Amino acid sequence: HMPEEEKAARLFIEALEKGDPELMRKVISPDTRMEDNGREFTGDEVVEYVKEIQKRGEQWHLRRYTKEGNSWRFEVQVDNNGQTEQWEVQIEVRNGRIKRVTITHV
Predict the structure, then answer these.
(1) Which letter does DSSP use for residue 47 in this model?
(2) Which of 43, 78, 91, 97 has the greatest CB tally within 10 Å of its CB?
(3) Cα dihedral sign for 37, 65, 45, 33?
């Protein structure tokens, strides 16, 4: 069994893994904000982000995660075109909804 907060963050990650904009649309809220290496996305832009993942054939795979303070920190492997990267995805779930997502890969 999975608590509601952990479940929501997991579904966000699943939508990335599946490259599935439809799932992502069901997870986020109009005020969800996401940052990926400087680029900012809010609301349906996050869905657009997933569309682009699906388009470019970018592959996400969840490796491991922990709860750090009041955010979930996911270690995700991201592949494309023969290159493999380790990215960090930090999710704050506030009041059962995805509030802020921070993607880091440097």
Answers:
(1) H
(2) 91
(3) negative
